[PDB]
Each structure stands twice: as C-alpha cells, then as structure tokens.
Symmetry: C7
Subunit: 284 residues, 7 copies
C-alpha cells in the first residue's frame, strides 16, 4: 500500500526517534480464575498531533471445564465456556477516543467450481435442475471465531465465540447440533453405553485446548487524546467475560440424549483503571 504509492517504506508511520513509556500491569482473579495483562506503551510523537497509548490486552481466561453437578446414575451435566469476550469501555465524558484496533473483521474467501453436467448422448428443456450441476467449493472453519464487536468512540469490544467442534473424528458438531434420536452430541463419549453419566463425558484433553484450560487474549487497541486537554487523565475499564453453558445429558435407557442451554451463566471480571498521561504511566 505505502510502497505502492512509491512512498519510501516507513515514511507514513509513527513511533520513531522519540522516548516512549511502556509498562506492566498484572492482576489475577482468585475466584473466576481470570488472568489480566494490559501491557501498554505511551506515544508522544512530535509530528503526530495527538497523544497515544497502545493497549495490548494480554492475559488469559480459564475454561473451568468440569462436571459441575450430577443428578443420578443416568442424568448429569457439564459446564463449558462458550464465548470469551473483552468489551473495554471508556466513560463518555472523557475526551479520549478510540482510533484504531486489531484484530478486525476480514472477508471470508470461498472457492467454487463445477465438475460435469450434460444431457448425455442419446438424449424447452429448461429443467429446474440447472442449479443441480457441479457445485464443488472449499473453505475453512476455525472452531473459535475471533469476531470484532461493532465499536464506537467509547466502547471497543471483541467476542471469541464457539463456531463448531469435531467429536470422535465424526461430524463437525456446533452450538445446536440436534439429532432427535441421540439429542446433542457435543461432548458425548458413548451413544448406547451404560456407564455413569457424570463419568460419561468426553475427555477435555482430546478436545479443543481452549475449553479445557482456557483462552489467552492477544488483542490490541489504541486510544487517542487531545494534546491540549486540561486534564490529562481518563478511565480505562477492562472487562474479561465468560459464558458457561449447561450441557446436560440423560440416558433414555436406549441412548444418551443431551440438551445444552444457551448462556446459562456468565462471569464479568471488570476492573477500573486510571491513566496518568502526564506521568505517561498506567497506575495499577
């Protein structure tokens, strides 16, 4: 892009020959098991008109993939995290504004084709099967899709939701995955087994790593502030969320039918913060 306009590389960039102020803020949630890391770097480029503070939202959010409760030798349920979210918010009254953020929403690329279709040899003719022709396509489906919640001048949000999961190397089961005979098969182990329901749950290790241990954010954001602002201080609200579902399962005495509610429980490890732009330091 930059070099495509024949501009020398790095000419239209920022963060050079200046004294920046980085930092390190670490916080842990003893109850929800959520790790927090908001590594920052203040930018005060002279050529750049406004101030900057690139916010790197590191850390991790645990999974808590465990059997929360059992209700008999044939009935039991499991709670698993379904959507880790980070909706950072900035108070309206503050003049500070979000101006750039990564990741973002990118186009999804398909690859469609057509193999063979003709009216044979021995054989007005506007059959409806004209769409019933070669339809070869291809694309990929990551199990967790890092979406970007539609931001604004105040709130920048992300949502890493559950797309689908493969079980027993058979069927890309998703958040609904309903089979009338067997119910849902998201984390099943035996279809017609007679084992204990609490113990008849798919092993967390042989599944996606995100569910078992957790997920680690690596998202980034920059907030821009007027250089001539009287008060060089704002409020950063960091919010780590989790959406546990209720993947219940019961034995119909013939096969195991399971039902999963949507967003049964939520967690919110919100945390206030203060930015000392004058000191170019994010106070803990």
């Amino acid at each position: 892009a930059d070099s495509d306009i024949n501009i020398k590389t790095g000419t239209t960039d920022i963060g050079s020959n200046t004294t920046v102020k980085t930092g390190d803020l670490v916080t842990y949630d003893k109850e929800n098991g959520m790790h927090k890391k908001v590594f920052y770097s203040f930018i005060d480029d002279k050529n750049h008109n406004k101030k900057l503070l690139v916010i790197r939202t590191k850390g991790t959010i645990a999974g808590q993939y465990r059997v929360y409760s059992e209700e008999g030798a044939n009935k039991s349920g499991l709670a698993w995290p379904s959507a880790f979210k980070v909706q950072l918010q900035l108070p309206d009254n503050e003049v500070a504004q979000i101006s750039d953020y990564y990741p973002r929403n990118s186009i999804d690329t398909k690859e469609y084709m057509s193999t063979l279709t003709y009216g044979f040899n021995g054989n007005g003719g506007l059959i409806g099967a004209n769409v019933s022709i070669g339809h070869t396509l291809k694309y990929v489906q990551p199990d967790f899709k890092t979406i970007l919640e539609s931001p604004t001048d105040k709130k920048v949000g992300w949502k890493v939701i559950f797309n689908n999961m493969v079980n027993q190397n058979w069927g890309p089961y998703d958040r609904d995955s309903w089979n009338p005979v067997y119910g849902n098969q998201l984390f099943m182990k035996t279809r017609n087994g007679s084992m204990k329901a609490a113990d008849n749950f798919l092993d967390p290790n042989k599944a996606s790593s995100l569910l078992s241990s957790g997920f680690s954010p690596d998202f980034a954001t920059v907030i821009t502030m007027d250089r001539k602002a009287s008060k060089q201080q704002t409020n950063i609200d960091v919010i780590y969320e989790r959406v546990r579902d209720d993947y219940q399962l019961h034995w119909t005495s013939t096969n195991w039918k399971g039902t999963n509610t949507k967003d049964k429980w939520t967690d919110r490890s919100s945390e206030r913060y203060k930015i000392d732009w004058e000191k170019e330091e994010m106070t803990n």
Copy 2:
C-alpha cells in the same frame, strides 16, 4: 519493476530525509453508528515538484443487523447492510488533484482445463458437443468485493458490495438467489418450520462478520497540489455510506418464501474538512 531496470531499490521513491507532518482526526456518528478515521501525513519532498497529503481512510461502519420490524406471527423482515461505500469528493474550483489511490481493480485469474473426451473404441462427425468436453476450471469468490469506483481529478470512490453468502453450508446464495418454491434463502433458518418469523432469522454470529458488527475501511489516497499555489487550502469531503436492504420473509403455510428489495434505504455520514497546507495540518 524498479530493480528489473537495474535501478537501485528505493531510488525512484519519495518520502526520505524530510520532515513530514502526520496527525489524527477521530469522529463518531451517534445516530448512524459510523466511525471516522482519516489519519494523514503531509509530504513536502524537495526533489518532488508538488505537495502531497496521503489520506488514510480508516475507521469502521456498523452493520445494524437487526430485526427492524415484524408484521405478524408469519410475516417479518430484516434490514442488513449491502454496500459500504466511501466516495470522497473535492470541490472543482480547487486546484488540488488526486494522483494515486489504493486499492485498485486487479485482474481475476481463472484456471481452465479438460479431463477426457474421445469417440470411444467401437465407434462428418462435427457434433455440437465439441464444447461438451472436459471443462474443469477453478477460481475464488470473496463474499465482499472491494471495487474501485471509476475516479477522476475530483472524486475518488470505493464500493465494497455484497458478492454472495453461504447459508447452512449449502449453496452460495447471492443478492438475488431466487427459488420459486422457497423464495430467497439469504438469511433463512427453517424452510418448513412453524416458528415465529421475527425469530426465524439466521443468527448474525454464524454468518459473515461484516453484516453483524460492520466493516472497517483501510483505504488510502493521495492528493497532489501545486507548490506555487496562492491559497494553500482546499476542502476534503469524507463520505461514509451504507445501503440497507429489506429482506422480508413470510410463511406460505407450507414453506417460508422471502423477498429482498434492492437499496431500500441508504445513509450518508458526509463530513466537511479543511486542510491547512501552510500549517501542514488537517484541522478537525
């Protein structure tokens, strides 16, 4: 290209050993939900005869993918954005001129072939089926095609229109996608379901990310101005648009037939701007 003429890399470039002026202008639309970011960098290279101001049109445009209205337990509609556009315009009287822009329109590459065709073994002969031979091809179709509206010395425009969308992992449905029995199936959930029409709409998360939250421009442009101009100031008109369609659906008591009008509503978050070339600053 440059090195292919044996020129040393970077010799025929601009933006070196000079003092450039960058900046930051952020604006948000409280009603249309449109974000605006026009990050700029003034260029005043001595070897280069004219002035420059590379305009980087960042920001985002929301999607507003929601059920706008319902008209009964069997009839309802949805409004979804179809074409985000950025048609920046510059007044005619101003001597400032656009000279380069990215992205542009690139050639589309196919890959055609032929598998097998012959007159068997046991078998003048100019059958019409000579085109009915091996026709294997391959290419890709992004769901949103970032077109470049044919620019001029004043107006440089872009249009990120909707190419197609895949639903239920079955059929690359597009802006027309008409099936006489079922109507349009762009965002359907159940074909023969009996659920509420307002609630019988495909979930925004399991679709393209652009529709749900929105789309973020990353387009760039440069306007060149005479170095000996008496008045070192022009007018930049930044325009963010959206084209919501009207994807209604109704139950024929047998199956759900939906119709989508074209360009039912539009939005235009136009914004005047002033460039202080003398100050090498884009005033807010």
Copy 3:
C-alpha cells in the same frame, strides 16, 4: 543472476549516492473520462555514461460500461471497453532512445501428463488412437492479458486486451463466443426471458471490475539520452486509448441472440509533453 556470478548484490546497478529529480504531472479528460499520471524521476549517475528519465505511466482509464442505445422492447445494445492501450511515441529526429521497459512478454508454463492407457487384459496394432491417451494438463488464463506491443527505438507500446470472461459461473466466454442458437452470451442475463432488452444486460458489478469502472496503468519505461547532446530537450507523447465494442442483443421471440462487432469505436487521449533535461524537470 547478479549473485550467481558471485557479484556482490547491487554492484551492477544504478541510482545510488546521487541527486535525482522526481515530479508529479496530473491531467484528466473531461470528455473521455481518462486519468493521466506520468510520475517521473531523472537520473544523472556519474558512473553511468548516459542520462535517464524513468517514466512511470500511472493513472486510469474509465470503462463507460453503460447502455449506449436501445432500439425497441426486444432489441438493444451495450458498449464496453475491449482493449486499453498505451502507445507512447517519441519523435524520430530526437536522439533520445528507449532502452528498457517493464512489463514484458513472459513464457507461458503448461503442465502436461498422462493418466492411463493400455490394451486391456484379454486383448501391427499401430492404431491412430495413440494420441488418444492420458492428456491431463493445467494452466491459468487471466481475463485481461497485459501484452507488450513490439517496441522500437522510438515507440514503446502496450495493449491490455480482453482474453475471456465467465458469465453465470458457466462457460469462459471470450471475444467471439458464438453459439448458433443463442448467439453470443458475453453479458447476457436471461436466455429465454421476456424482460426489456435494454434492462436485460448482466450487472456490471457482478462482472470483472475493469469493465464497470475502468483500468489503471502501472507501466514503466526509461528513455536514455546522450550526455553530450547540444539540445537537452525532447518530446514525450503520452497516448491513452480505449476500444469500445458494440455488444447488441435482440430477441428472436424464442431466445436472445446477441452479436458483438469488433472495434466499433475508439478513443485517443493523446497529449504532448516537453522534457527539460537541463532543469531535470518534466514541464506540464
């Protein structure tokens, strides 16, 4: 190549530790809708015996893809650009000479093979079907082929002609694409439709981007001049062309048969220019 002779990289290059003169010339065609950009960079390397001026032919040429005329509810035509050309010419009397140019004409790579052929099991024998064996191949066909018109010491020409186009994801139709029953199907929408012919044309957005808006040159050239020339000035003739065709269509009351003439109309946005080698500046 250079390093293959064990020469240090960049040793046999030009454009280093010297003062070059770049520039910017912008011009627009109010009638033909053609943009012009001849970004230049003068080279006066001391080690290099001759002078240089690398000419970068940027800009764009509009498409003007519109329904030029209609001749009844069943007969109508469309004019679409078929070959954008840039034939720069330099007057013969001038000693200035072209010496290098990019792009050029490159070899086309096929990939041929053979799957299976044998005289079975139960089965002198020099059948003509010895060529009727495994014939698997593969290669790519870009829709617009940037050819290099055979240059000389005076004229360097390019021609970006139309190779083929895919319609309805069915058939790589080309500049002739004749089917006796249906005529030409380059930009058809309905084969047996009853809609208005002027409105029965394939949408420009769902086709190649070049036809709808236009095409943007990025070609480059260098002209070399004697360093001891008495008159340090020549004449650059920049020429942007377009070849609109006449893709008419008519309804045979059974199906739509269309005919496309070849090179029905042309445009030539020729422009004289003057090079001030003494000033190392391209005067507008």
Copy 4:
C-alpha cells in the same frame, strides 16, 4: 498487528539499549534420567516500569522405553512415558507474578466441504439423510499435543500428552484403541504370532522418537516483579514430570490381547531455585 496501527516496527517492544544479564544452569537426574536447563536473561529496561526475568525451560526428559517386567512366555508388559509435564510454581507470599508465556493454546482449523447429493433424475421429502450429504473434511493430528495448563499468577503449567500413534502403517491408534478381539494394539508386533511376549514388542526406533529416547522442552516464561520491592528475591520451583503407563500384553493362545492402564506410575524431579534480582543472577 503493530505495523497495522501504522506504528514503526519495534516501537512497542522491550529489551533495547540496556545491559541484560543472561546465565546458564545445568542439572541432571542420575536416577530418573531427566535433564534440566533453565537458561535465563534478566531485563531492567528503564522505560519498562517493572523488572523481568525471561525463563527458558530447555533440557530434556528421557523416555525409559524398555520392557520393565515379564510374567511368562505368553504374558509380559512394557512401560512407556505418556505425558511429559512442566508445572513451574512460585510461592504465594512472593510478590513476583507471571505475565506472559509461550507456547499457548491456539485455534484448530478444519476444512469442510460437500461433493455431490441430489434426488437423481427419474425421482414432503424431508428425509433424515439431509445430513447424509457430501462431508469431505481434512485436518492434522500431531502425535504429541503441547497443551498449556491453565496458568495463574503463581503456577504456569504445560502438559505434552500423547494424542495418537500409527503402528504398522495401519490405524491411528490412541490412548484407548480397544479392539475386543485383539485388545489394544499400541505397540504390538505380531497379532497371531507365537514368539516370546517380552520380545514381541514393537521396536522403539520404528516408532515416535519421543517414546524411545525422550522429549526436549523448549518452553519459555517471564515473571515480573515490582521495581520498588524491599526484598529482591523469590523462589523458582522447576518441576519435570513423566507419566509411565503399563502396556501389558498376554497371549489368548489365538491372538495377543493387551491392556494399558492409565497413569500407573509418575515421576517428579522437582528442584528449588533462588533468584538474586539484586545481583541479576539465578543462583544454582
């Protein structure tokens, strides 16, 4: 990411123009055969508010893949390592905190498709076989999955567990791999052989290299400490583990049926360590 916000590369980084202190600590387990390497590098960047000590956990853990015992000409067993783990722990009372770690848990990418499905030619119709359509998919399964145990402010853990193994180039056998007739076939050599059971074990060289010799960690971690801490010293607990299983096998006089217990034995080469932050040295 960094350059996507147009920041100059390396601007938002640490570890520059400062005097760091590296080191080398080597320790070996004469009994368990575990190698230990905790290569370290102290960081005291002035711009960075806190202290750092990036911990590189090199070394190796042997496999001890040998026939531990035999119980007759037809019955014998083998002990093989199933899960190498490194759960470094830091005492709670110490203010030192973990802030970043690599590797982490990444999304798993599938690639799903659909080949062909239609209601033929000669042939309401809501068959249950609508999911019985083209389901072409592909992905990769590494035999050892480097998982990241859900960390916290004190404990950062890893677990390189056994995913699956291919035997005789036939069947991706895993940790359960139960066939009722033949039992488990993880490390079998002959299915209906009459050879000695202790000698009827798959050769360690023609299997995964990890089991035979061992596995070498290359994991990394950084602990951050308050710069104004009164006591500049903490306690690093490095722990190398192993989980030997009991892959026994017996001859049923017709075929060899083997059973593998889960986590029969474990090893823990825990090692206390002391960090002299004042000296910027990790004492052995």
Copy 5:
C-alpha cells in the same frame, strides 16, 4: 552453499568498496526490427586478480508475425519466428576469456509413482504387463525453452527455441504436430471452414505473446582479461538472430491441411563493438 561452509555471507564475493564504470549502448534495426541493449559494468576489484566486464544483453527481437504471402482463395502461408538466438563471439587472437554466464542448463524434475495394480481376488506369472502398472507422473513444459548453447573460451551462445503451443485449448501442438487427415494445426482457425486461407489464420493476440510482438533477452555474461595485458582492448560481436518458418496451409476441399518447413529463412543483426578497458568504457 557459502554459509553452509560456515563462511560469513558475502565473504567469497566480488564487487565491493570499489569504483565501477557502468554504461548504456542502444541500437535499433530499422529493417529486421531488432532492438539491441548491451548494458555493461566494468569491475576492477583489487583483491580479484583479473579484470571484469559483466555484459547484460537486454533489448528485444520482434516477431514479425504476419501473413507474408497468399497464393489463392484456398492456399496461403504465414511466417512466424521459431528460434531467437544470441551467439556472442570474441576473436580468437584476443586474450580475453569468458568465465561465467547465466542462465545455464538446469536439471528437469519429474514426480513419478504408482496408483494400483494387483492380481485381483479369485485369481510363473511373469506377464509382460509388469510395466503396465500405476504410472502417475507430473512435470511442466514451458512453450519457449531458454537453452544454453555449449560455450567455449571464445563463443558463448544461447538459443530460445519453440517447444510447443496450445491451440483452441486442445492439444499441445509442437514443431512437427502432424495429423495425416488435417495436416499441421499450429496456427489453424477452422478445420473444415470455407473462409479465405489468408484470413484463416489464428489471431496472434490469442496465442503466445512472443510470436506476435517478439521476445526480450535478459541474458548476462562476464569476460575476464589479464590485468597485465599490453593492449587493453578487444572486440565484442553481438549477434541477434531469428528463424522464421514457413507455415503454409491449403484447403483439400474437405479440410485444411498445412505444412511447416524448418528454418526457411533466417536473420542476423550482427554488430561489432570495441571495449576500451583503459577507459573502462564500451565505445558505441
């Protein structure tokens, strides 16, 4: 290679910290339409014992792809270039010697294996069909093969000959391509057409770009000379060739049979040159 011996990159190279002399020689053939470009760069490295002059043979050779003559409404011919050659020669008496040249002759890589062959189920047995097994292979065939004519201390030659060409996307026709019924089909348009033979020739644009306009050399060579030579001057003979064939065609009143002679005509734009090693300049 160099770094594989642990040598620092660039240590065993030439052309550093020295004053080289480049240049520019341009010449055009007003009759044969051949462009000549012998861009040069003198090398006088002190560490290197001998002198150098790396010769870069740029320029182009036209195609002259036109209907040379017609001999009736059914008989006509076409002349097309078949082998562009550059055989640079240096006089024997001169002590100057060629020492390195690019391109060179490289190995051709195949990729072969077997799919399936077995003696079925129901079925000494040394059938001759043991070679009639899986023969899947793959490789590529460029249409023009840049061969390196076997050089010597005096003559360094190249030959870019015609390998094959694809017509009508059907059959990789080559320099012989004989079919008894239809003759040769190298540049045919209609097999059983009744159109004028002079006009019944494949369009040059829809074929390889080399034939229509021409081909551009980019070959390189270096000649090494004794540093203590009394006479610091030699003679460079640059030779650009072309081999037009005679692709005639005639109508047998049933189908068009064409014959192509081999090397019917040739062209030789030889050019003497003088090297002033003392001046480190290639005089025109």
Copy 6:
C-alpha cells in the same frame, strides 16, 4: 517466541560484541574410511555466567557398499551400512556439562479424515465396521531418520538409522521386508534371474546416495563449564560408528531368497581430544 513476549529480537541471545576463538581439526581413518571434522568456536560472553564451546561435528562416514564375499555361482552376500552413529562422551569426573544440542526429536504430523460412509438408501445397527469408514491419511517417511539418543550430563548421542528403501519403484522395503516366497528384497536385481549372485546385486548408484558413498554429519553441540573452575581443561571423546549388515542372497533354483542379519559387524573410530579453555583452543 522471543518477539511473542514483545521482547526485541536478539535481546535474549548470546555471542555478541565479544572476541570468540574458532578453529579447525581434521582427521581421517585410513582403514575404516571415516572423515572427522569437529569445527569449534569458544564463547566467553561477559553477561553469560559460564563458558561455552559450541561443537560442530562435521565430516563424513563412508559407506563401503561392496560385495564383501561370494560363496558360489548361486550364493553371495553384500555388506551395507545400516546405522551411522555419533555418541560423543565426556568423562564423569570433569565438571563440564552438556547444555544444548541440535538436532532434537520433533513431533510427527499426520493428516486424517473421512471420505464417505452411510447405510445406503433402501436400508441396533452397532456393526463392528464403524471403524471401517473413510480413513484417508498421509505423511512422509524419510529413508534415514536422524534420531537423538537420550542424552545426559555426560554423553550426547545420535543415531541415523535406516528407515526404509524403495527398490524398482515398487514397495517401500525396510530392515525386515520378509516375503516367504522371495525372501528379502532390499537390494535385489532379478527375482527369477539366472545371473551370477555376486553380480546380481542392485547397483549402488540407482539407490540412496548414503549407502554407496556415505553420510556426512552436520550435528552440533555445546558444552558449558564453570567460569571459576581451577582446571580449565576436559576431555572430548569423538566417536564415529557404522553398523554393517550381512545382506546375503541365494538362488532356490526358482527364485532368489535373501536373508539379512542384524548388526553383523560394527566399527568405532573413537578419538580422544583435549580442550585448552585457558588458551581457548582445541588441541589436535
């Protein structure tokens, strides 16, 4: 990894702004035909607490692929090297310790999924053929697998053993490769031939290059030593091994049955060495 923690590249590295001592030790085995090369480089980084001497084990080990003996017109054998090994050892009493080594043992990656399996159309149902489903898989098998012998604080060992070999482009024969009718076919030429057995051996050139000439180590190791050690000297034991097998073959008057013993003969070109850490030199 390093940059993933946002550390500047090269910050956590060693071997900079210091004076290192390299060297060159060459030795050849006149009898076993083993070449020895232990290229070294002493490291004395001030920031690094300990000393270093990176040991690069270059050289080669011959193959000696020849017909060692013949025992009649129908019986003969061949000796071929099966496992080149380099087990460097360091005496226990010496405080010097191995701390890092490359290559190491890496995970093996498969690629598995399913094509198609269903219960047809016209057709409780827990058939054992549920594993008999789409089992498409693929991976690579190098013929010589560079394993890493499980090291310790004293001995670091490698073993490049024979995985498999392809003969006659038919069958990936391995170290056992037993066919009851034909015996082993590792290096056979004719299955039912009548030629001399000593001459009926597969040509060494049309096989793997390692067997014919030999194999060249490129392995590396580093030993770390206490900086405050009283005696700055240890003993490096370099050992190059070879494991010739006995691939005999005999004619059963119908077909050639061959047998290959395991590890029939071995060679050990052990060599003592002395490191003068004080001189920073490896004495020959």
Copy 7:
C-alpha cells in the same frame, strides 16, 4: 541451528573483518571441449587457527551429442555423455587437508499411506494380500543426480550420473530400459519407421539440455592447511571427466532395436595447479 542454541546469528562463522584474496583462472580444452573455472578466495582469519582456500569449481563440460558413425541405411549409432565427474585430488605427502564440501548426500523423502481396503459387507483370514492394500505414494526423480563420491583427506570427488529420461512424453526410460521387442528406446524417434538410421535419432533440443550442449559444474570445496607449515605450497589436481556411451540402433526390418553399451569411452581433462599460500594466489 545456530540460533536454536540462542547464539546470535553469525557468531560461529568465519570470513569477517579480514583481507581475503580472490582470483580467476580460466582454461579451455580445444579437443574435448571442456571449460575450466576454479574461482578461489583465500581466507586468513586470525581467530581461525588454520588457513583456508575455498575452491569454487565453475566452468562447463560439453555434451558432444552427435551421430559418431553410421554403418548402413538400417544400422547406426550415437555417442552421448552419461556421467560428468569431477574428482579433484591432492598429493598425499602434502599436509593440506579437505575439511568441508558442498553439495553433499541428502536424505530422500517419500509420502506414503493407504486409501481403502476391507472385507466387503456380505463376507483365520490371514490372507497374503495384507500387503495388497492402499499404497498411494509420491516422490521426485531428477534426471541427473548430483552424487558425492565418498571423499577422504586427499581426494574429493563428485559424479553427476544419468538417472532417467522421458521420451515422446511416454515412459521414464533409464540407463537400461530394455524392451525385448523394440530394444532400448532411450533416444529413438520412430519405432516402425523406414527412415535412415543415422537420421532416425531423437532431436537433441527436445531432450534434456545437458546432453545436447553440456553441463556446468557449480561445486565448491575448501582445503585447510596448517598455519605453521614450513612450505606454504601444495598441488591442486583439477579433473573434468565425461563418460560417453554407445547408443547404437539397428532395424530388424520390423522395428528398431537399439543397444547401449556401458562406459564405452571416457575423457579426462586433468590439469595440475600450484597454490602460492604465501602470496595467497593460485598461479595459473
């Protein structure tokens, strides 16, 4: 490797901040048509204990692919080069030793798995067809294999032998390629033709480029010498070889059967040389 031990790149290398002596030696064989180029670069690194002279064996060896003799209208032969070899030798008495060489012998990588095999549906059972299962495999076979002759402290040799060749795009014929009916088909043109045998030979241009013109070595070697040697001079013996075969062919009056002898003739362009290590110059 180097950076894998966390060593800074280039730390354990040679050839830096020192004055090296390159050179240029050119020689041509007027009879055998062999070019000779032994480009050299002396290395005298102070840190490195020994001396160095990296030998780059450039040049070329002609092919002489011509019809050597004809013996009747039906019988004729062709001589073609089969194995270009470079066996450089150094006299035993000289202390100079070879220590590193490129290219070397590398492992060959296959890619094998199974597609489908099962005992059907309607169908102890240890059939011999258990090896008759999915055997999909793939790998590459270059036509000329650059082998490394097993070197020693004195002689370093290479051998670029003929692997196979494809004729008529049908069959990868090799050095034996015997078919009883047609004989050898290495360079045949017509199988049942009646043309002159001397003229019935495959055209050299439509075959591998190596045979027609020749092959160009690019091999490299380094010889190391004691720095304290009394006599700083040795003897380099450069040897370029060729192995012409005798590919005769005769007409059996039904088909053309050809026989090719092995190594019928050889050539040896040996050349003595002298190294002046004191002068750091390779005298011609």
